[PDB]
């Protein structure tokens, strides 16, 4: 539909606060009477706040006090039941005029209705009402003269009121304002959904329940420790939320009945207080030693249970967010002894109450606006999980208790990484190119600067160049070093290397010499090829051939036949190219990436994106950077045509788009900084013929995405994930949805990829929690060149594989999985 407004939008949501201000601030009640007013009056005769009425007068709100004791009662078995005892707790009152007591009797066997306003009522107040009702029935059938209270709500107030102004007052106080300084303000628990600007008071609740057995055996565990079991369930939910929420500290909320005095256990009024439990876990705690911490703090909490929760944040913080509820945003509230609860004051609401069978029962309430049903139940199952660990074992690391369930764990691990495809798994990469060449011979393969070749023409230049390698001792896992800028002759370098059965080593000659003679002497390569014009030198008993020029015609005098594959004698297992990386701060790392990883990677590209002979690939990424090994050879292995873009031609501002019309290129890769560059460019509406564009190296934000969409509304565009050590990528998301998160994913693992997020100690997580990426399958590189022992600190052996040998690739990258089986990239680990 039309969107609304900003205005309109954030009106909306004003108004949406009149109905939670309608359903929150009501008491409802429900007695069904099974059998054959002077009851109903009696009660009200003998509650002085019954009768009570509020005005204002004179600057200040009143209590005007009555006398009248007069019951205003009102007069399809589905239908009527469920929606006319929610529209009598939705009718609105009034505090002047009309009493606050509302009831509706309708029909032997006749359902009473109860309703009472939060201002002359609590929800224990109503359990007094059920205690009069029950008892001034039986006595009317077989007020004052019976039983009589011993105060009324108006005395507590004038207690209240002196109470507040007193020392004792400014104690509690005290203690609240040092309990609670410093504590987390918002919890971080994973969100199915963006927390919204105003607080969506949209709720839906779930049923749980604590079989017999677990119920008796937290009830052992609770008298042992000399715990309640509310405190029991508090201490087991903080420490669930802590972990899933990765925080030290949670602040969880429980109302109270403050009627600690004897006197004030038979009034009703208005008496529920709130308490802010502030529960640490760091320090990696037992559960023996969580349990006496809460136990503390508890009873610490319930001694001060008089001051107002209103005036601990006033004094907490008087400055406070409109998207959350201030202190604590989930509360634990246990009813020791109603229809289904839609609406949320808080994330998270866990009510239990221990049944008659002695088995605990409850709901949790949740925001609808920040998860999904599904979230909230294994919310649940953790919780559940969590209790029944504390039973079995008092005395392990609480934050350690496994709580996933067998179908996530399952889904997780092997569901979600559900990608065997068939793929060769016995070619090497030049081999798809040579395939492709005797598919097309003809067709163009390479453009620059005017100059073509076709397949055939490109396949015997690098079949020269490959064997003047070989006869330099060029084989299956040598390095030969190659440095060039952008032409033809780079693209027939790295294709004779391959041909060769060694591995291209990228030089950029943009790079300081310093870094360039590193790599040439880390890499140790066997051969140097060079483009005429550079200077680069490597000694060391180094080969060195020119790759144009006059200096590269005596290479030309070879012929122009393929080699064998006993001749290369190179396989899979070998390596294709070492690609330097720098680690944060120190020397760059040669990775190690095999053929088979890079086969894996190109033929999966083709069955996602389906590149055809027709279209153009523009080769715009230095060629030090793994982005350009798609760029190379996922054309040449489908028999599209590269175009080599210009050296440093992007100095000029208008040779990218001017490059793009002109040479009709379909497919590009930009970093996200740059894709900004490419949106904000003059002419980049002229670009309606590219049909692709790939995006990796940084995080993608949803605006460059909805804006790249309304300069291009035909472009197809791709959100691509992976380091270097595994393979260029590994995860990819389309951003073909109808309307584009903020937040872009990375999507799911391509083929023959796996994905796993795992906690400290190596385990998984719950969905939605952030953990360290770890990269399975068959594109994880052999290692860094030279460095083993770093090798071995990243790469780690695969415990999920089922496959001896397997090794997974520490990322240091943070990550969660999302509802429908996305990965989210969350930033470094560190
Ligand atoms: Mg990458």
Redesign the pocket.
Known sequence: NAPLSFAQQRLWFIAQMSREASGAYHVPGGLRLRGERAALDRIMARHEVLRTRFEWHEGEPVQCIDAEARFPLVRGEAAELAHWQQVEARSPFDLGTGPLIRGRLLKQEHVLLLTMHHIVSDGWSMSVLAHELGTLYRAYAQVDPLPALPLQYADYALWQRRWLDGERQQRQLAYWQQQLAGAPALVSLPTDRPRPALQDYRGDSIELTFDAGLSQGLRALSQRHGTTLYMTVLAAWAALVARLAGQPEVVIGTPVANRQRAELEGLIGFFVNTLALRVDLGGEPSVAGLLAQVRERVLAAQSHQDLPFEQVVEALKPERSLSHSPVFQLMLSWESSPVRERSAQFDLSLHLHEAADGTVAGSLTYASALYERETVQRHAGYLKALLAGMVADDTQPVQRIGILGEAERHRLLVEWNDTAREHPRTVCVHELFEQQVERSPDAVALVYEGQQLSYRELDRQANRLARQLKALGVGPDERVAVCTERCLEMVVALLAVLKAGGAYVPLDPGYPAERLEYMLADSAPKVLLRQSGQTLEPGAGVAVLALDGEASQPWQAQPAQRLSRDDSGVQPHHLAYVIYTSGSTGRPKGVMVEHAGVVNRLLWMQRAYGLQPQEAVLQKTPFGF??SVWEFFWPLAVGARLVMARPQGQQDPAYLVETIVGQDIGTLHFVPSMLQAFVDSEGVQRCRGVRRIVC??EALPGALARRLRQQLPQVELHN?????E?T??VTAWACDAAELPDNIPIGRPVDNTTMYVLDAHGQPVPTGVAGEIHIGGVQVARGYLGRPELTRERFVPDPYAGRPGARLYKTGDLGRWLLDGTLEYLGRND
């Open positions: 793994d982005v990796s190296g691509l994930y992976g380091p270097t595994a260029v990528d």
